């Protein structure tokens, strides 16, 4: 409330000052000063981190509705370039969604005709920022800027050396896979964009550029039809050691000490990054989680954490830490949760060894093998006898004649075995040790603890004992357990 007013008290009659100077033209000698007065301090409304961010966005209707942006866009066709290069900056600085809708509606084509000139770097910088903020409008404008020569300009500017221009290009190329659907993402690889992102990703000069290029390539390799072409480009390998080495605290310190790029993505379109956490490609998940925890660490130092509340993003992070096989992604998510001030959820698993006959009946009903329940009732099978159930006793004593039926039952049996709770009998925590190598090994953790096997007693084992006592039947799994067990021979 009160902080909100102090922003527009100066901003409002000073943005009117701006309006005045825009539409009062003394040609090159006086438009210049006006643009400097409104560049020095209008952009400093992004330098007030208390209020004054929201104010700008809302206040853009006082400029856009009066027609000032339209007036200058009608006056940016002046043949001289000096009074145009310094004027196109406030265009990208005053681009918000409401200001974006009418430029996407009317006035399109002057940017497409100004993008033809690629020699002045001070001009190309502003044009790259314009295309960056224009990509994010809607699907139709994305299809029009890919159908026109919009992509060629930012694709040609990838061979330059300017740091700000390359950063703006990296940020520009990433607002296309978001608002492009699937056919535009299938056209971008046809327009050879994923290859021209190799220099922006392999850049030991700025880490910000590497992060932006890797998020831009990761948001595009989720489509299965173009994934086989994105891996051919030679860039899908760079995202893993990048997110591995870089700590999100360092990237936050590189974002909080810089005078710009504060409150980077914002609560407006952040949700487009959320399905990447749930996507099939793991590198998209880790880069999304990395960006989320970084901006969380940025925003946690202030009292702006409650914007996580009404968007329900903390919920999405809490749903992805339990039952998730990814060390980096789960580590970053747990770091984000513990830094934001919330607890990590623990999975609730069925305590199978301490079961009775009724629970075995109910589970047999659940897995669809109800026809055999009475047999299991006659022989008095409970959880301890169920977890140690073999094929011959299944065939003779329980009457499963077919081999396919027994294969199906053992499939459901192993699926239940990997997802059980063994804390009632496992003291030395062998389940996590087995799950560390592979989750598919956790199913053995009962047999081991049933055969009096412990961590401290695990390295002095033979493959014959694993085969006959612990009941491990696959030779591959036996070999892996043996080589991972005897490597830690006399560590204690």
């Amino acid at each position, epitope marked *: 409330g009160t902080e909100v007013q102090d922003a527009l008290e100066r901003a409002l009659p000073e943005l009117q000052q701006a309006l005045s100077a825009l539409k009062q033209a003394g040609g090159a000698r006086a438009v210049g000063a006006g643009l400097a007065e409104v560049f020095q301090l209008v952009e400093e409304a992004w330098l007030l981190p208390a209020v004054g961010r929201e104010v700008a966005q809302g206040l853009c209707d006082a400029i856009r509705l009066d027609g000032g942006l339209d007036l200058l866009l009608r006056l940016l066709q002046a043949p001289e370039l000096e009074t145009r290069v310094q004027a196109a900056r406030l265009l990208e600085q005053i681009l918000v969604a409401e200001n974006r809708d009418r430029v996407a509606r009317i006035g399109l084509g002057v940017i497409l005709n100004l993008a033809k000139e690629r020699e002045p770097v001070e001009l190309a910088r502003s044009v790259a920022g314009i295309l960056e903020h224009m990509f994010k409008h809607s699907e139709e404008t994305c299809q029009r800027l890919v159908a026109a020569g919009g992509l060629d300009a930012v694709l040609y500017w990838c061979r330059r050396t300017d740091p700000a221009l390359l950063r703006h290009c990296a940020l520009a190329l990433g607002n296309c896979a978001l608002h492009g659907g699937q056919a535009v993402q299938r056209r971008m690889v046809e327009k050879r964009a994923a290859e021209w992102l190799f220099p922006l990703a392999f850049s030991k000069e700025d880490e910000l550029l590497r992060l932006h290029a890797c998020l831009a390539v990761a948001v595009l390799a989720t489509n299965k039809e173009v994934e086989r072409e994105v891996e051919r480009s030679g860039t899908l390998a760079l995202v893993e050691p990048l997110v591995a080495s870089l700590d999100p605290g360092r990237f936050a310190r590189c974002l909080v000490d810089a005078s710009d790029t504060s409150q980077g993505r914002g609560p407006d379109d952040l949700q487009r990054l959320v399905p990447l956490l749930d996507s099939n490609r793991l590198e998209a998940q880790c880069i999304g989680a990395f960006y989320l925890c970084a901006e969380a660490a940025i925003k946690s130092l202030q009292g702006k954490t409650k914007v996580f509340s009404d968007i*329900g993003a903390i*919920q999405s992070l*809490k*749903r992805l830490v*339990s*039952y998730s096989t990814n060390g980096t992604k789960s580590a970053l998510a747990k770091r984000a949760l513990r830094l934001l001030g919330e607890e990590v*959820p*623990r*999975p*609730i*698993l*069925p*305590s199978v060894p301490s*079961w009775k006959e009724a*629970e075995v009946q*109910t*589970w047999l*009903q*659940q897995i*669809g093998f*109800s026809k055999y329940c009475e047999s299991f009732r006659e022989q008095q099978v409970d959880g301890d006898l169920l977890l140690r159930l073999t094929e011959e006793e299944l065939q003779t004593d329980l009457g499963m004649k077919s081999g396919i039926t027994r294969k199906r039952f053992f499939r459901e049996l192993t699926e239940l075995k990997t*997802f059980a709770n063994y804390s009632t009998c496992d003291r030395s925590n062998l389940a996590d040790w087995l799950g560390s190598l592979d989750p598919r090994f956790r199913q053995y953790t009962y047999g081991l603890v049933s055969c009096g096997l412990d961590r401290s007693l695990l390295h002095r084992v033979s493959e014959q004992q694993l085969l006959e006592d612990c009941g491990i039947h696959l030779g591959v799994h036996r070999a892996r357990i043996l080589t991972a067990a005897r490597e830690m021979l006399h560590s204690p």
Partner: nanobody, 113 residues
């Protein structure tokens, strides 16, 4: 963890017509491995009606396939079972079940006029 479940819905419906039953848990529904809805006819043994796992993979018996739908909601932690076309033989006491041991209370459902 001692998990308590509560069921809501049921009563009497006209033969042919929809209904929605809900089971609400005391902890986060995303932590629980498996959830399920069971049916108990008068004077018989229980039967399973719907299952759902942590990744939203559901399985139904061949009798109710295409008429019943199970889904979990995480905003308010509640699993819903929606019945679309009811037949006179679907009169029973319905339960929810968490993991395999945690039971609910059950509600009566009848279909007549």
């Amino acid at each position: 963890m001692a998990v308590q479940l509560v069921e809501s819905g049921g009563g009497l419906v006209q033969p042919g017509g929809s209904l929605r039953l809900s089971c609400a848990a005391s902890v986060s529904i995303s932590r629980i491995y498996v959830m399920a809805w069971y049916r108990q006819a008068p004077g018989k043994q229980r039967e399973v009606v719907a299952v759902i796992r942590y990744d939203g993979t559901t399985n139904y018996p061949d009798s109710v396939k295409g008429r019943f739908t199970i889904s979990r909601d995480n905003a308010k932690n509640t699993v819903y079972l929606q019945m679309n076309s009811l037949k006179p033989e679907d009169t029973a006491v319905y339960y929810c079940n968490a993991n395999v041991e945690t039971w609910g209370q059950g509600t009566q459902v009848t279909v007549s006029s």
